[PDB]
Structure 1
């Protein structure tokens, strides 16, 4: 079930959670915790995303994903932080899967604000399934 040989060197964060709820330090904390667990599991995600920006609303998804595709050669993944149930999820999947062919992984804001080994493990397993056997 689990894939070896994944190395995620070029990846982006698109934060659809409001900055006042999911701060720069929450993003840095979450990213560092994800770096360490993904590494321990032999699917290392490098500590520094090439891009980390806030956006709001489903209409921002296509412009930002077009920008990412146009700017970052060898981009392997966009981690999308969502604030609860939101039409932004459907739009991220429409643009990523059907328009631009860009791998995306969505995560709940509450799991970025406060991490646990179990929820970082849940996320690594979803990423592994996506980026494994390409």
Structure 2
């Protein structure tokens, strides 16, 4: 619970989906992104609707190679959104690689909240993103 930061605009961002495509499908990703676009806009921290990158991956060992690829490919990358399938070692590895190795902002979200969104869970995510990107 901290104050909302204004002036944030997220133009370059990526999705890394560690949940199985057969459970979290392309249309789920698209729908979730559209709902996130609208609420973040309304809040005055607009996340643009089209991510520069959206791919599936499996297992903690895929995290470092993917994040290095992101850093090496997308200039001005501001955020990687990471979809997790429940409790998984992927989370710990995303934090190690993002926060310690490469210095890349990452925000995790649970697969269930991508499959079925609610205003409250989208708000939860916006606030987390606002904290991470706001005081920099």
CA distance in 1: counterparts of 2:26 and 2:73, whole angstroms: 22
Aligned residue for 1:65, secondary structure, equals: helix
- Deviation of 1:97 (Å): 0.2
CA distance in 2: counterparts of 1:77 and 1:86, whole angstroms: 21
TM-score of the two chains, using structure 2 as the length reference: 0.98
- Deviation of 1:133 (Å): 1.0
CA distance in 2: counterparts of 1:100 and 1:70, whole angstroms: 11
CA distance in 2: counterparts of 1:18 and 1:116, whole angstroms: 21
Aligned residue for 1:110, secondary structure, equals: helix
Confirm or deny that 1:27 pairs with 2:29: yes
CA distance in 1: counterparts of 2:40 and 2:60, whole angstroms: 29
Corresponding residue of 1:73: 75
CA distance in 1: counterparts of 2:112 and 2:135, whole angstroms: 30
Corresponding residue of 2:132: 130
> CA offsets per residue over residues 48-84 of structure 1, 9 Å max, x none?
0000000000000000000000000000000000000
Counterparts in 2 of 1:21-100, with a 5 A limit?
21-100=23-102
CA distance in 2: counterparts of 1:107 and 1:88, whole angstroms: 12
Give the aligned length.
Answer: 134
> CA offsets per residue over residues 104-130 of structure 1, 9 Å max, x none?
000000000000000000000000000
Aligned residue for 2:46, secondary structure, equals: coil
CA distance in 2: counterparts of 1:111 and 1:44, whole angstroms: 20
Q: Structure 1: state its 5+ residue gaps.
A: none
CA distance in 2: counterparts of 1:127 and 1:11, whole angstroms: 12
TM-score of the two chains, using structure 1 as the length reference: 1.00
- Deviation of 1:25 (Å): 0.1
RMSD: 0.2
